[PDB]
Design a protein around this nucleic acid. Structure first.
Ligand SMILES: [Mg+2]
Ligand SMILES: [Mg+2]
Ligand SMILES: [Mg+2]
Ligand SMILES: [Mg+2]
Ligand SMILES: [Mg+2]
Ligand SMILES: [Mg+2]
Ligand SMILES: [Mg+2]
Ligand SMILES: [Mg+2]
Ligand SMILES: [Mg+2]
Ligand SMILES: [Mg+2]
Ligand SMILES: [Mg+2]
Ligand SMILES: [Mg+2]
Ligand SMILES: [Mg+2]
Ligand SMILES: [Mg+2]
Ligand SMILES: [Mg+2]
Ligand SMILES: [Mg+2]
Ligand SMILES: [Mg+2]
Ligand SMILES: [Mg+2]
Ligand SMILES: [Mg+2]
Ligand SMILES: [Mg+2]
Ligand SMILES: [Mg+2]
Ligand SMILES: [Mg+2]
Ligand SMILES: [Mg+2]
Ligand SMILES: [Mg+2]
Ligand SMILES: [Mg+2]
Ligand SMILES: [Mg+2]
Ligand SMILES: [Mg+2]
Ligand SMILES: [Mg+2]
Ligand SMILES: [Mg+2]
Ligand SMILES: [Mg+2]
Ligand SMILES: [Mg+2]
Ligand SMILES: [Mg+2]
Ligand SMILES: [Mg+2]
Ligand SMILES: [Mg+2]
Ligand SMILES: [Mg+2]
Ligand SMILES: [Mg+2]
Ligand SMILES: [Mg+2]
Ligand SMILES: [Mg+2]
Ligand SMILES: [Mg+2]
Ligand SMILES: [Mg+2]
Ligand SMILES: [Mg+2]
Ligand SMILES: [Mg+2]
Ligand SMILES: [Mg+2]
Ligand SMILES: [Mg+2]
Ligand SMILES: [Mg+2]
Ligand SMILES: [Mg+2]
Ligand SMILES: [Mg+2]
Ligand SMILES: [Mg+2]
Ligand SMILES: [Mg+2]
Ligand SMILES: [Mg+2]
Ligand SMILES: [Mg+2]
Ligand SMILES: [Mg+2]
Ligand SMILES: [Mg+2]
Ligand SMILES: [Mg+2]
Ligand SMILES: [Mg+2]
Ligand SMILES: [Mg+2]
Ligand SMILES: [Mg+2]
Ligand SMILES: [Mg+2]
Ligand SMILES: [Mg+2]
Ligand SMILES: [Mg+2]
Ligand SMILES: [Mg+2]
Ligand SMILES: [Mg+2]
Ligand SMILES: [Mg+2]
Ligand SMILES: [Mg+2]
Ligand SMILES: [Mg+2]
Ligand SMILES: [Mg+2]
Ligand SMILES: [Mg+2]
Ligand SMILES: [Mg+2]
Ligand SMILES: [Mg+2]
Lengths: 252, 130
RNA sequence: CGACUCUCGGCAACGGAUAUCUCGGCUCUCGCAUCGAUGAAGAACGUAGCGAAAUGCGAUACCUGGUGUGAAUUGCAGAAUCCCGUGAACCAUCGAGUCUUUGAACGCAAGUUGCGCCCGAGGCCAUCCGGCCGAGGGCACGCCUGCCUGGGCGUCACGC
RNA sequence: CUAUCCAGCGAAACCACAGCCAAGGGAACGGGCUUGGCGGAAUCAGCGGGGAAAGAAGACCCUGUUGAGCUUGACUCUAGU
RNA sequence: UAGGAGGGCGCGGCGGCCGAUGCAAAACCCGGGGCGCGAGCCCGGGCGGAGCGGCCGUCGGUGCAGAUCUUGGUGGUAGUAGCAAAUAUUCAAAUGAGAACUUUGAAGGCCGAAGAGGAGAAAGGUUCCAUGUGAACGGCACUUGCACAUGGGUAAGCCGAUCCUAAGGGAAGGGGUAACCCCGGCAGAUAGCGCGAUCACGCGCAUCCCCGAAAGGGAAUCGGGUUAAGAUUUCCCGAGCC
RNA sequence: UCGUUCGUCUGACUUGGGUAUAGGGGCGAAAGACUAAUCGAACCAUCUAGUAGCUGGUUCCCUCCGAAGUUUCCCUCAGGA
RNA sequence: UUGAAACACGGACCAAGGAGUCUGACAUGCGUGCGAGUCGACGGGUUCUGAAACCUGGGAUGCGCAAGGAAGCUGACGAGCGGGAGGCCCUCACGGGCCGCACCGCUGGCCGACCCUGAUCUUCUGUGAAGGGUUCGAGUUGGAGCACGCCUGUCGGGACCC
RNA sequence: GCGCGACCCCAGGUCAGGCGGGACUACCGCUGAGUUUAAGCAUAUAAAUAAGCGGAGGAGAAGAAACUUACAAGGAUUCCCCUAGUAACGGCGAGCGAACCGGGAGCAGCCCAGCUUGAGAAUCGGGCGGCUGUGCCGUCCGAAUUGUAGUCUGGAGAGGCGUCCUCAGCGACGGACCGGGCCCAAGUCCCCUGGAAAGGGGCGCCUGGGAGGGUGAGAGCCCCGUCCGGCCCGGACCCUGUCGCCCCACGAGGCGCCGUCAACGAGUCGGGUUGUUUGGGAAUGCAGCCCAAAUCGGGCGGUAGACUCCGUCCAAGGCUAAAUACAGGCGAGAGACCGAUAGCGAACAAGUACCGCGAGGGAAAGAUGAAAAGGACUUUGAAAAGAGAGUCAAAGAGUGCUUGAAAUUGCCGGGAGGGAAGCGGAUGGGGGCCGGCGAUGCGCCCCGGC
């Protein structure tokens, strides 16, 4: 975010002064002088026309908030897992109905592609082009004030392409496509993996990138990640199947 | 998406630039498209419109009306074409306004400068496709 | 049945809320370093075929010149040679120019277009081979380096 | 000469809602409440009983750890001498 | 009641999802139908003519009846209070759409000259004069005007300013001052040197620069004509003066 | 401000223009008078949104719980712990 | 306000605007992450819609991990009891027994300020076997903390508005 | 009846030059409050702040220890984090409040004065002339010996000796950075609606380009642009990349030894006292006055004092990038900001109109339509206007014109009323409105076909 604030001097560029009592008018400061309609009018008050606002906004508001380095990594881990669950990728709105398998890993030959047309064929050979269809079809003008605040068009989210090898070209084949995002494997972002705060981004992994995941995040073992001071989080419940536990022989 | 961090993507500035452009800049903005026959012949898509060109309206209520350019009235972002008129209430005749992006230039007013300008634009469109 | 008052509805007024906008504002970030005695910032008066303001300009006065572009400016009128070219334009841009009266403001002043002095290209006669009206241009203050002119037994030398 | 009536022109103060009384009770003097008296469209000119009428965040008095002008044997300083 | 908490409703953005709309979006209007204890919500009809809504998360300049609240608009009061100083108007005619209010003539009155007359200084700035004029304005009215529009109009050797000094002001060197600024007699090769000379030199230098009066001091003009509007003395005629 | 009536009118008289004195300063035949409708300290801007234990106001719904005017100390008694 | 329909004040009407906010410190509660640790908050690297994101350092930066003394200084030698949720053993079972978390109560040991004490050793002024105390500590005999986020409260700030 | 030379002063419209004033964001110097807080108030705080007076630059200021520390010590300046709300200061109250260490950003050090040309001012300015011209050369005047140049700056240095080791410039082409001009993908194909297609349906295409804007309604393909880059023109540059010629020295420097020398800033330091300032406490800096130094000497080691030792540095002259700051200027780019009573006072001929003698004060006011197509003509009227008509998708969108709320007002229709009206519960009468306002289907069956 960028800060916003009113002018520090706004509403305070008059020599206005209270008439006091005894003149059958309220005690608000008033513009003195004469010869214009401004004379005798109220000033400086948040109720007055032309006054300053109550508690004027300042640029030393707390715009940026800090999150622990470890809590950031934990949340990325949870987001990645949910990308591998078809029910959650469905529920978050992605059309995944002709995709062969989740996780969706495509060969490294995709890496070298060049054109938006080339990228379109790749999405067709997967079951991915339908989700990209919805993103492009959903583009319209943003209702409200944002359409005049340089945010004129909005759309849906498509799939997210993750590549592994730095310096590739699929960055440039996919960027014209609305909804479609590209990421490098080492530096994934929570804002892409769970956009809107909702779990289940549709991810197309390259074979180059899917094999680096174990390098990047490691396992339930100390000092296995590429990250330092990090170990994958363990759940409070080893198997979440209430069906299996409640209807096991031991409990019944 | 833009790459040059010196061109503005702001609605406010881009509009100001358009509506406060000088005359030498409105010549480019008030540009028209070549006809299918001329695009085929000169390998250029669109050109800045000229005094003595010949056009054909392709969008207005006057769609399918051909005529000669008689005035490129840049101050109103408009061109008047010969016989593209209506009559006032008193019976006088006035020329109606056409924006250059709603006509096709069916015939070119060719000069030394226009021939060189067609060359430069033609050298370009081929310099990428080839 | 009526008048008046109150009230409900429809229509018409009054007024400018609401909605939808926006060449404006506000905030953050970035780059750069450029006023003046070679007369600045500011003030005044002028200036267009038709203009008062704003914008622009300075008696070359909404401009001159060069360069780029390449056919308009436009509210009306007119020249339009300005159209395969030294070439339109309330065009862009900048090297050549112009730049009234003032203002630190500088010959003295100032509720004054007041009051001096100096130079002087150009022209007239002869009261000289000088004098008369001159176009233009000087004459503030403090200071530095040099210079010219000069002063004082301040210290000397040499004399008379 | 006004006021008055006519043609033309044409404000402002004020305004919770209003506007007939008697007694009672009530923040101990009601236009509204309680109980009685009553009570009939719409208008004109006056009048100063009432609206505890208008005007003005009582100037009297008190309070405030609010002032200011002035004085001095108040406290703390200071120009001058 | 004061006070505390929970669960909701509503407004505007941001990240996401799901959608409406030129076969009519938002806003607004209604004696239209309903839902909810309620905040509110849904639909109908109309008007309008291009945008809008619901859900999850999140965020905020987020909900009005008051504050002698702020700004704007609007009533009753009310066709009411009121239009009453300076003696005063009347008759015909012209004009005009329209005359108590303009114009001409006649009559009756007033100012009564320390004037309601004729001219100026200050201050104003075109109000001056002609022609025309829809609105507004001239607290009734108007053909009218000190209004509006378009034009025109201010002529100097002799009137002034300009020159001189008054009270007084500013001021160079110097004194003070952190500096802006403050001090003029303090006396400094005081600013300026003046005069005779040029064909060069001589003399003298005393209380000393500037500003300051359209009523003080002061080179010089009178009479007769002339304009829609300039002049008694600025223009014309004549006659003079410095 | 107006009407009538009054005071003075050769003087310490009336008056124009010029000039001098500027804010804890001026000027005062003295009334705290006057210093541009402002005077027991002018006016303008800023410090400044000065401080207020004091007055006024403080914006949606439902559901649930629900007081105190008493103790001690305080230049404390309209306040606070 | 003890008390308002008040002969208490404000309110003619309508529209729009109009008042507990932002920030810093602290505290309790709650949520998240890690845990004797925990923060990457000044930087660096990298990042092609991102001033974003992502990586890196810390072997000692902050807070915590140890306290008592004004200071010089010294610095925790290892806990029992009563009641206890819950588990287990016994009984036909009612009843009994065993172990007993948190928490409440009770009595102690140890560290330190102050007092008291003194075998041995020793560099003669130090050490400290033993033995202590109606004294004092925000101590120890339970490692629980650190970071972020939100409400509320106190305070500083124009500080709910005039 | 002299003429001298120098000293100190003159006056010059002398030759040539440089000074003053303007702007306020950030920077340097001075001067300097009170409101306020302490629940009063005076020291204190507000504050070494506002106002006042000056001076600069693109940054400024500071800067190379007369520094810290007490350690195995470090090593110019500035800025960030930490130290730290700490030591301290304080009616020890309210409150206030740094630095060292450590970690980062950025790093760079220099030059004078003095004993030291004396066979010799070797230095410098100006006029004039010339040329290769930001300078060099010749010459004539002058400054300066009361001292210009060269050496030298404590880390040193002068000397002496010594195998040794080190040194001169201009070309040529460029690379980078800087400004500018141009060129660059794809549908306006078919039907419908519409005033307008940029909307819907069909069929296609571009995409390293689906940022943005314009065009008669949501346009990637209509236009400008955007991506990838291509081209042509002009600069400043003093940075380095390579080819060419020129070859650096007996001068200076480095390095090895030597011990003889070894110069180092004065009304200044330092002390007293006064006032101010500071966290600085027997006194942190600064300033007035008084006293007033030293050269086995001087300044420090955060409690005043004397002595012994120890650590440490060398003031009184000067220059010095970078890292930092930046409500002004100019040129940009953005935004979870405002949407005409909001946002700057000003979206508009806004610091305008207007007010005040003045210093100063200071508004209101945006939106026809896609296009003026801005309403010819007839008729009534003195006119303004009206009634017909005309334009438009529309004027009932008619030049303060998108929408067009409320208060308040007029007309038409309806309803009720004995000194208020409105209101809450009941219901009765009128209205007005409600067809998901209210059903006609399901099971046995008999055909007659699907
Ligand atoms: Mg009143
Ligand atoms: Mg404002
Ligand atoms: Mg009448
Ligand atoms: Mg009674
Ligand atoms: Mg009453
Ligand atoms: Mg009764
Ligand atoms: Mg009656
Ligand atoms: Mg009456
Ligand atoms: Mg009465
Ligand atoms: Mg009253
Ligand atoms: Mg009172
Ligand atoms: Mg008290
Ligand atoms: Mg007092
Ligand atoms: Mg005393
Ligand atoms: Mg907001
Ligand atoms: Mg608010
Ligand atoms: Mg209201
Ligand atoms: Mg209320
Ligand atoms: Mg009347
Ligand atoms: Mg009267
Ligand atoms: Mg007389
Ligand atoms: Mg006249
Ligand atoms: Mg009238
Ligand atoms: Mg004079
Ligand atoms: Mg005179
Ligand atoms: Mg005179
Ligand atoms: Mg004559
Ligand atoms: Mg009287
Ligand atoms: Mg008399
Ligand atoms: Mg008399
Ligand atoms: Mg007088
Ligand atoms: Mg006088
Ligand atoms: Mg008295
Ligand atoms: Mg306040
Ligand atoms: Mg009270
Ligand atoms: Mg009472
Ligand atoms: Mg009463
Ligand atoms: Mg009261
Ligand atoms: Mg009232
Ligand atoms: Mg509101
Ligand atoms: Mg740590
Ligand atoms: Mg126990
Ligand atoms: Mg215990
Ligand atoms: Mg607060
Ligand atoms: Mg001082
Ligand atoms: Mg303050
Ligand atoms: Mg106080
Ligand atoms: Mg107080
Ligand atoms: Mg006080
Ligand atoms: Mg200041
Ligand atoms: Mg410097
Ligand atoms: Mg700490
Ligand atoms: Mg302080
Ligand atoms: Mg194109
Ligand atoms: Mg189409
Ligand atoms: Mg568009
Ligand atoms: Mg293009
Ligand atoms: Mg001191
Ligand atoms: Mg320096
Ligand atoms: Mg505004
Ligand atoms: Mg305003
Ligand atoms: Mg319509
Ligand atoms: Mg309309
Ligand atoms: Mg529209
Ligand atoms: Mg309208
Ligand atoms: Mg209404
Ligand atoms: Mg009726
Ligand atoms: Mg009823
Ligand atoms: Mg009923």
């Amino acid at each position: 975010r960028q800060p916003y604030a009113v002018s520090r001097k706004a509403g305070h560029q008059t020599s206005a002064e209270s008439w006091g009592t005894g003149r059958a008018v309220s005690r608000i400061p008033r513009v003195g002088g004469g010869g214009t309609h401004r004379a005798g009018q109220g000033a400086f008050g948040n109720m007055c026309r032309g006054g300053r606002m109550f508690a004027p906004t300042r640029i030393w508001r707390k715009w940026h908030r800090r999150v622990n380095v470890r809590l950031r990594r934990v949340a990325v881990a949870s987001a990645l897992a949910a990308t591998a669950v078809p029910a959650i990728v469905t529920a978050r709105g992605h059309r995944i109905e002709s995709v062969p398998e989740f996780p969706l890993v495509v060969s490294d030959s995709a890496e070298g592609i060049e054109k938006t047309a080339q990228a379109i064929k790749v999405l067709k050979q997967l079951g991915a082009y339908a989700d990209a269809e919805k993103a492009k079809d959903s583009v319209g003008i943003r209702p409200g004030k944002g359409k005049m605040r340089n945010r004129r068009y909005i759309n849906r989210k498509g799939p997210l392409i993750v590549y592994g090898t730095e310096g590739s070209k699929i960055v440039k084949a996919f960027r014209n496509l609305p909804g479609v995002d590209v990421a490098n494997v080492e530096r994934l972002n929570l804002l892409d993996l769970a956009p809107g705060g909702h779990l289940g981004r549709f991810v197309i992994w390259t074979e180059s990138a899917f094999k680096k995941l174990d390098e990047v995040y490691g396992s339930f073992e100390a000092s296995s990640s590429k990250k330092k001071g990090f170990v994958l989080p363990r759940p409070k419940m080893t198997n979440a199947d209430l069906g299996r536990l409640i209807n096991s022989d031991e409990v019944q | 998406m833009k790459r040059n961090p010196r061109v503005t993507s702001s609605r406010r500035k881009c509009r100001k630039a358009h509506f406060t452009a000088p005359s030498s800049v409105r010549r480019v903005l008030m540009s028209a498209a070549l006809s299918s026959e001329l695009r085929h012949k000169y390998n250029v898509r669109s050109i800045p419109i000229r005094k003595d060109d010949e056009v054909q309206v392709v969008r207005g209520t006057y769609k399918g009306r051909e005529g000669k350019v008689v005035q490129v009235y840049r101050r109103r972002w408009v061109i008047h074409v010969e016989r593209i008129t209506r009559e006032k209430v008193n019976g006088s005749t006035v020329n109606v306004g056409i924006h250059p992006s709603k006509v096709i230039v069916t015939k070119l007013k060719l000069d030394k400068d226009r021939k060189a300008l067609l060359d430069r634009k033609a050298r370009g469109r081929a310099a990428d496709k080839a």
